[PDB]
Design a protein around this motif. Structure first.
Motif, PDB file in Angstrom:
ATOM      1  N   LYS C   7     -32.458  39.523  51.768  1.00 56.18           N
ATOM      2  CA  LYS C   7     -31.467  39.970  52.743  1.00 56.18           C
ATOM      3  C   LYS C   7     -32.131  40.394  54.051  1.00 56.18           C
ATOM      4  O   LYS C   7     -31.655  40.064  55.151  1.00 56.18           O
ATOM      5  CB  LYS C   7     -30.648  41.117  52.156  1.00 56.18           C
ATOM      6  N   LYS C   8     -33.239  41.127  53.948  1.00 54.62           N
ATOM      7  CA  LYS C   8     -33.971  41.546  55.137  1.00 54.62           C
ATOM      8  C   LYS C   8     -34.483  40.343  55.918  1.00 54.62           C
ATOM      9  O   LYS C   8     -34.436  40.327  57.156  1.00 54.62           O
ATOM     10  CB  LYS C   8     -35.124  42.460  54.733  1.00 54.62           C
ATOM     11  N   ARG C   9     -34.978  39.327  55.209  1.00 53.56           N
ATOM     12  CA  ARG C   9     -35.445  38.115  55.869  1.00 53.56           C
ATOM     13  C   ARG C   9     -34.314  37.432  56.619  1.00 53.56           C
ATOM     14  O   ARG C   9     -34.512  36.938  57.733  1.00 53.56           O
ATOM     15  CB  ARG C   9     -36.063  37.162  54.846  1.00 53.56           C
ATOM     16  N   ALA C  10     -33.117  37.400  56.033  1.00 57.97           N
ATOM     17  CA  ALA C  10     -31.981  36.795  56.727  1.00 57.97           C
ATOM     18  C   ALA C  10     -31.626  37.557  58.005  1.00 57.97           C
ATOM     19  O   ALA C  10     -31.341  36.944  59.049  1.00 57.97           O
ATOM     20  CB  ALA C  10     -30.779  36.723  55.789  1.00 57.97           C
ATOM     21  N   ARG C  11     -31.632  38.891  57.945  1.00 59.35           N
ATOM     22  CA  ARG C  11     -31.337  39.682  59.142  1.00 59.35           C
ATOM     23  C   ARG C  11     -32.364  39.429  60.245  1.00 59.35           C
ATOM     24  O   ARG C  11     -32.009  39.194  61.416  1.00 59.35           O
ATOM     25  CB  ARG C  11     -31.296  41.166  58.784  1.00 59.35           C
ATOM     26  N   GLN C  12     -33.649  39.470  59.887  1.00 58.33           N
ATOM     27  CA  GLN C  12     -34.691  39.191  60.864  1.00 58.33           C
ATOM     28  C   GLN C  12     -34.547  37.783  61.422  1.00 58.33           C
ATOM     29  O   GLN C  12     -34.794  37.546  62.611  1.00 58.33           O
ATOM     30  CB  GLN C  12     -36.063  39.386  60.227  1.00 58.33           C
ATOM     31  N   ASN C  13     -34.126  36.840  60.579  1.00 60.06           N
ATOM     32  CA  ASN C  13     -33.942  35.463  61.017  1.00 60.06           C
ATOM     33  C   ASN C  13     -32.895  35.375  62.114  1.00 60.06           C
ATOM     34  O   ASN C  13     -33.113  34.721  63.140  1.00 60.06           O
ATOM     35  CB  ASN C  13     -33.546  34.593  59.824  1.00 60.06           C
ATOM     36  N   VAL C  14     -31.747  36.027  61.919  1.00 56.77           N
ATOM     37  CA  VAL C  14     -30.688  35.896  62.922  1.00 56.77           C
ATOM     38  C   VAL C  14     -31.110  36.549  64.239  1.00 56.77           C
ATOM     39  O   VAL C  14     -30.888  35.990  65.331  1.00 56.77           O
ATOM     40  CB  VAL C  14     -29.346  36.445  62.393  1.00 56.77           C
ATOM     41  N   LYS C  15     -31.759  37.715  64.167  1.00 56.45           N
ATOM     42  CA  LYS C  15     -32.186  38.366  65.406  1.00 56.45           C
ATOM     43  C   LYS C  15     -33.207  37.515  66.163  1.00 56.45           C
ATOM     44  O   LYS C  15     -33.094  37.317  67.391  1.00 56.45           O
ATOM     45  CB  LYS C  15     -32.748  39.752  65.092  1.00 56.45           C
ATOM     46  N   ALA C  16     -34.197  36.978  65.446  1.00 56.90           N
ATOM     47  CA  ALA C  16     -35.208  36.150  66.090  1.00 56.90           C
ATOM     48  C   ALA C  16     -34.600  34.881  66.661  1.00 56.90           C
ATOM     49  O   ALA C  16     -35.035  34.398  67.712  1.00 56.90           O
ATOM     50  CB  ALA C  16     -36.318  35.815  65.098  1.00 56.90           C
ATOM     51  N   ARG C  17     -33.598  34.318  65.982  1.00 54.00           N
ATOM     52  CA  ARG C  17     -32.942  33.130  66.509  1.00 54.00           C
ATOM     53  C   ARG C  17     -32.292  33.415  67.852  1.00 54.00           C
ATOM     54  O   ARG C  17     -32.422  32.619  68.791  1.00 54.00           O
ATOM     55  CB  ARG C  17     -31.899  32.614  65.524  1.00 54.00           C
ATOM     56  N   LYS C  18     -31.596  34.547  67.969  1.00 50.64           N
ATOM     57  CA  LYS C  18     -30.982  34.867  69.259  1.00 50.64           C
ATOM     58  C   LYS C  18     -32.030  34.991  70.363  1.00 50.64           C
ATOM     59  O   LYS C  18     -31.878  34.407  71.452  1.00 50.64           O
ATOM     60  CB  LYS C  18     -30.163  36.150  69.151  1.00 50.64           C
ATOM     61  N   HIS C  19     -33.111  35.726  70.091  1.00 52.13           N
ATOM     62  CA  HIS C  19     -34.134  35.930  71.119  1.00 52.13           C
ATOM     63  C   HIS C  19     -34.772  34.603  71.552  1.00 52.13           C
ATOM     64  O   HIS C  19     -34.899  34.307  72.758  1.00 52.13           O
ATOM     65  CB  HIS C  19     -35.176  36.909  70.581  1.00 52.13           C
ATOM     66  N   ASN C  20     -35.156  33.777  70.575  1.00 54.43           N
ATOM     67  CA  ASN C  20     -35.790  32.501  70.882  1.00 54.43           C
ATOM     68  C   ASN C  20     -34.853  31.587  71.657  1.00 54.43           C
ATOM     69  O   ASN C  20     -35.292  30.865  72.561  1.00 54.43           O
ATOM     70  CB  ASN C  20     -36.245  31.820  69.594  1.00 54.43           C
ATOM     71  N   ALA C  21     -33.564  31.584  71.302  1.00 53.80           N
ATOM     72  CA  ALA C  21     -32.616  30.742  72.019  1.00 53.80           C
ATOM     73  C   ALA C  21     -32.526  31.147  73.481  1.00 53.80           C
ATOM     74  O   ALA C  21     -32.474  30.285  74.369  1.00 53.80           O
ATOM     75  CB  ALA C  21     -31.244  30.814  71.355  1.00 53.80           C
ATOM     76  N   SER C  22     -32.512  32.454  73.753  1.00 44.93           N
ATOM     77  CA  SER C  22     -32.508  32.901  75.146  1.00 44.93           C
ATOM     78  C   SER C  22     -33.704  32.341  75.912  1.00 44.93           C
ATOM     79  O   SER C  22     -33.552  31.764  77.003  1.00 44.93           O
ATOM     80  CB  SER C  22     -32.499  34.426  75.208  1.00 44.93           C
ATOM     81  N   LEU C  23     -34.907  32.489  75.353  1.00 46.77           N
ATOM     82  CA  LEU C  23     -36.087  32.035  76.095  1.00 46.77           C
ATOM     83  C   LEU C  23     -36.097  30.515  76.289  1.00 46.77           C
ATOM     84  O   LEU C  23     -36.468  30.011  77.366  1.00 46.77           O
ATOM     85  CB  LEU C  23     -37.358  32.503  75.397  1.00 46.77           C
ATOM     86  N   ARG C  24     -35.693  29.767  75.262  1.00 47.76           N
ATOM     87  CA  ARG C  24     -35.661  28.312  75.374  1.00 47.76           C
ATOM     88  C   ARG C  24     -34.671  27.864  76.446  1.00 47.76           C
ATOM     89  O   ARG C  24     -34.943  26.921  77.207  1.00 47.76           O
ATOM     90  CB  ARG C  24     -35.312  27.707  74.017  1.00 47.76           C
ATOM     91  N   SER C  25     -33.516  28.531  76.521  1.00 50.35           N
ATOM     92  CA  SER C  25     -32.564  28.234  77.584  1.00 50.35           C
ATOM     93  C   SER C  25     -33.177  28.480  78.954  1.00 50.35           C
ATOM     94  O   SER C  25     -32.946  27.706  79.891  1.00 50.35           O
ATOM     95  CB  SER C  25     -31.299  29.069  77.408  1.00 50.35           C
ATOM     96  N   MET C  26     -33.942  29.566  79.096  1.00 47.17           N
ATOM     97  CA  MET C  26     -34.640  29.812  80.358  1.00 47.17           C
ATOM     98  C   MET C  26     -35.497  28.615  80.762  1.00 47.17           C
ATOM     99  O   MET C  26     -35.436  28.135  81.910  1.00 47.17           O
ATOM    100  CB  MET C  26     -35.508  31.060  80.237  1.00 47.17           C
ATOM    101  N   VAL C  27     -36.313  28.125  79.825  1.00 50.89           N
ATOM    102  CA  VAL C  27     -37.207  27.007  80.136  1.00 50.89           C
ATOM    103  C   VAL C  27     -36.406  25.790  80.585  1.00 50.89           C
ATOM    104  O   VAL C  27     -36.725  25.139  81.596  1.00 50.89           O
ATOM    105  CB  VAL C  27     -38.091  26.668  78.923  1.00 50.89           C
ATOM    106  N   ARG C  28     -35.351  25.466  79.836  1.00 51.21           N
ATOM    107  CA  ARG C  28     -34.566  24.277  80.150  1.00 51.21           C
ATOM    108  C   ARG C  28     -33.914  24.394  81.521  1.00 51.21           C
ATOM    109  O   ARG C  28     -33.852  23.417  82.278  1.00 51.21           O
ATOM    110  CB  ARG C  28     -33.518  24.043  79.066  1.00 51.21           C
TER     111      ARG C  28
END
Lengths: 79, 82, 86, 207
Positions: C7-28
């Motif tokens: 369960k903890k891994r799933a929570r960390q997964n969703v938070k990291a996904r949001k952060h990474n998506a923000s940065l990738r959008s910046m690059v694009r």
RNA sequence: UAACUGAAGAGUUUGAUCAUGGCUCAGAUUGAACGCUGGCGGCAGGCUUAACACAUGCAAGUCGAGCGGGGGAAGGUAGCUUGCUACCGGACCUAGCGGCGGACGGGUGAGUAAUGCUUAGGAAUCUGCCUAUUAGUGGGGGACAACAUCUCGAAAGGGAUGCUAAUACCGCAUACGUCCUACGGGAGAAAGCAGGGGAUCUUCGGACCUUGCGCUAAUAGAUGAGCCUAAGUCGGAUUAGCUAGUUGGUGGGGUAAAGGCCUACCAAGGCGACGAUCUGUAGCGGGUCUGAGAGGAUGAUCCGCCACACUGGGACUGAGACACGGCCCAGACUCCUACGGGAGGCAGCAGUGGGGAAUAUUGGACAAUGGGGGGAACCCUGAUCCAGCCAUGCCGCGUGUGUGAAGAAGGCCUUAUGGUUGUAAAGCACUUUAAGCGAGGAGGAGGCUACUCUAGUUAAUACCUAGGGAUAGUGGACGUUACUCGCAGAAUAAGCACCGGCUAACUCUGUGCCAGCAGCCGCGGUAAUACAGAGGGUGCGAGCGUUAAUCGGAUUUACUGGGCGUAAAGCGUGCGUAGGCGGCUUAUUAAGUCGGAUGUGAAAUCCCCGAGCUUAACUUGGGAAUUGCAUUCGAUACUGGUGAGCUAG
């Protein structure tokens, strides 16, 4: 130290490409009679120097297209 | 990582170990890179107790293999014996 | 998930996904701006856009959002397209 | 398993003495029925036989004299065929090299059955240890002895007395004072009796 | 030293005969099942059927030496209803954030005839932890769980406002290597924690020195993975044409990386009788069984590779997954409910129902070998090591030994009193394997802690690291272990098939083409060596028979190794396409062919010589072999290619 093959061009219609027919003679595994086996290889021809009927040499290389992985080295005999 | 450890052979209650060099993620008695000796804890009579190839052992240690505890002790024993 | 660590891994997964998506959008977005300037065709404007775009690509490549080979490819191709504008 | 029951009927069927009896009295007086088979249709040895019958009866005689069953005998024949040399020669050497046979020919047993009983009950020591398996192969140079607990035993004394009347083998060096013997080599074919025809057994198992 | 040495036939067609040709039998083998019977030990094996549905328990955690809180025990101090209270510093514990692990280990063979597997090569890649080397670790900021308050819900779990720490997150500075470059230049990181300490300072408790574990940038090594090529890899023509991103090219996109991988244009290509396309079946190999060999059958248990996780489609996080016990979506099915709302996936271990001729315990320990976390102590581990059940197989042992005859009794046959059961039994004299009882007792445990000394790094004898010594504690599930010594007594222990020929072993009663037997040939209609019982005997023996299946015998698909006048078998006869084969001389080439060398052909398995198990099975050291593949160097008689020449076709 590179793998080379010698054959006869059977087509040159496509752009910068030749089809060469390789022939080998092997023994039948059970009946022992020597039989003829052939394969078709697509090679790469940068300047279209090759024609139909010539005897050419190819060498292995990295892929150039979907079906080409050989490049012409020299034309031994011209048709 | 690359490790040097014992692989269990032999029969029930009379184990016989091969000293192998292998990737640690493999099964204990499965895939390995190189076999460099053997250990027979219950040898008697003319049976050899321990054989180790010191040259290949040192070679793999230099390349970066990590000996296990028992293999390190056996290497010390063999060095003392030789 | 069945266990607490899953369960903890799933929570960390969703938070990291949001952060990474923000940065990738910046690059694009920065790459798209440089492409728009190039299609515009002015040399100085395209040069300014490229000079703005390079540091962001390098920072995200160093953070690991994209691969450094990807960053190098983008830099080389964009520089070639800008230089072609003469 | 192990054969238990009447012994003399085996000899009567085989047509000869297989020495399952101690030997104090001759076979003929002991049986009164030799020259006749033990069945209700008992007949003389003059009846016709087939080749298969001859082969089977030859192997059965060796099996009954040595007390060996069919599975172990077939294993013995396979081993003798694998080993180099004459197959029948190897088979006879293997049969003679058994521990219980060695005890019998060394004299501590009146019969191979008595020797086997002693070996099973651990009255006999090979080299320096108390074994209990009668099928053990004795090798050249081995030392056989009687356990100190098993010494001064009346059956052993009677057995050595009868052995003294019997012929001492050439390949066994045995002292009866301390009751110890030494094996030196496998008996050869000329040492063994010429009655046994190993060629029939070889032909049987080769089929 | 050695590494193999190997080939049997019989019955049946006819009043005889020879041939042809099917059918049947004698062998080996098994993850077997069933029937009768059943003592022990060692080593192995144990849902082949429904990839059918699953109750319950366990199979993935660990770190307080990364971080803030929060707990409850001991204490010490002060008061006094006097052994009770109020505070304070240390020792322990963990719900949350964070790191690493969860991509390994374990299960199964549904799918997949080639994106898989096997053998031999290649270039255009990435790679946590590990090893070596080089340059560093400066200075700031904004958040959010826990927490507090509110609310929904029986709860399980949800939602909303206000705070907070970090090795969580984001700017700025710096850059030996590194990336881009137009060769002028430009761009990009990081984090602290712990042990010890002489001197100094302490803006008041640390600074400072040092050593470890960390973190950042880079190059090699090792390991792991991705990608490409060539050859090989089961049937069907009562499946002949298939293919438009299809085949190639250019610009662009995309990937760690080559590439129609994607896209816009240009061209008309690409594959196929050497079997394309279509269809049926199937995980592949090392190996296993059979065979004199060539071959045939097969792919349980052990090892390597691939694929799958209730059925389909996706992506996220991460060094690594499109992830068995993670997420989203769709579908079918099942469960709880207080009708508000929720939950699930045994082809992991044990187990249940069902199917079946048929396959086991809802066991013990992490002591050993490994795997994960941690500085360590230590924690986790249905991997593993062990134990339980089953004659399922292989190997070993026992169920007693000697003597004992004017030949007991009884049974059976008879030519009617002899024969056989038979030395068999009784009697006499001994012995204690295995099982039972009692007593001792290895090895599987190397190590660790305590002490002492030495050598390193240091400012240091401190800390830490690496060694030596002796002593003492400490550590075994199996386990009442293997093994050894005593105790009583033959005391606890033998069945199954068959007896006409193939094929070892015969008589009497009973019945009468009935009851029945039967692998084939065949027995039974009143003297049945073939049915049933009995006596006797034969073969095996804790087993013995039957059924099923594979190879053999079968030269009965014939490559080794068969046939076609009359036994089955020459197209009604020509011509001719692809293909197969082809006269003589000479020169050249080195494709076929032959020889040498090198690399490779995993381990296990088979064979040989040894070693250890009381023997054997079994385990194990070293060889031999793996008849193959690839590269390279040579030979030129024959076949093929090229050049020239000739006339017997």
């Amino acid at each position: 130290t590179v793998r080379t093959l010698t054959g006869k061009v059977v087509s040159d219609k496509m752009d910068k490409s030749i089809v060469v027919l390789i022939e080998r003679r092997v023994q039948h595994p059970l009946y022992g009679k020597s039989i003829r086996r052939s394969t078709k290889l697509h090679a790469h021809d940068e300047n279209n120097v090759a024609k139909i009927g010539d005897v050419v040499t190819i060498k292995e290389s990295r892929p150039i297209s979907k079906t080409k992985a050989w490049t012409l080295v020299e034309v031994v005999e011209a048709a | 990582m690359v490790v040097i450890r014992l692989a269990r052979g032999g029969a029930k209650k009379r184990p016989f170990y091969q000293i192998v060099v292998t990737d640690s993620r493999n099964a204990r008695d499965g895939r390995f890179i190189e076999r460099i000796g053997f250990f027979n804890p219950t040898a008697q009579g003319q049976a050899e107790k321990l054989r180790l190839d010191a040259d290949r052992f040192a070679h793999w240690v230099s390349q970066g293999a990590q000996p296990s505890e028992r293999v390190a002790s056996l290497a010390a024993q063999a060095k003392k014996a030789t | 998930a069945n266990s607490a660590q899953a369960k903890k891994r799933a929570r960390q997964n969703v938070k990291a996904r949001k952060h990474n998506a923000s940065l990738r959008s910046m690059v694009r977005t920065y790459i798209k701006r440089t492409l728009s300037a190039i299609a515009g065709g002015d040399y100085a404007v395209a040069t300014e856009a490229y000079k703005k775009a390079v540091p962001v690509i390098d920072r995200m490549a160093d953070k690991g959002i994209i691969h450094k080979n990807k960053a190098a490819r983008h830099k080389s191709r964009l520089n070639a397209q800008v230089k072609a504008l003469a | 398993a192990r054969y238990i029951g009447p012994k003399c009927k085996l000899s009567r069927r085989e047509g000869t003495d297989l020495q399952l009896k101690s030997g104090v009295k001759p076979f003929d007086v002991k049986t009164k029925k030799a020259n006749k088979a033990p069945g209700q249709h008992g007949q003389a040895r003059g009846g016709k036989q087939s080749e298969y019958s001859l082969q089977l009866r030859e192997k059965q005689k060796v099996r009954r004299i040595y007390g060996v069953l069919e599975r172990q005998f077939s294993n013995y024949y396979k081993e003798a065929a694998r080993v180099k040399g004459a197959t029948g020669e190897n088979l006879l050497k293997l049969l003679e090299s058994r521990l219980d046979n060695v005890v019998y020919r060394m004299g501590f047993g009146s019969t191979r059955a008595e020797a086997r009983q002693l070996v099973s009950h651990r009255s006999i020591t090979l080299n320096g240890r108390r074994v209990n398996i009668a099928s053990i192969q004795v090798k050249a140079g081995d030392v056989i002895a009687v356990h100190e607990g098993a010494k001064q035993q009346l059956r052993i004394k009677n057995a050595i007395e009868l052995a003294a009347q019997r012929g001492i083998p050439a390949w066994i060096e045995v002292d009866h004072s301390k009751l110890e013997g030494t094996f030196k080599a496998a008996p050869d074919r000329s040492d063994l009796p010429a009655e046994i025809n190993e060629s029939l057994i070889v032909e049987l198992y080769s089929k």
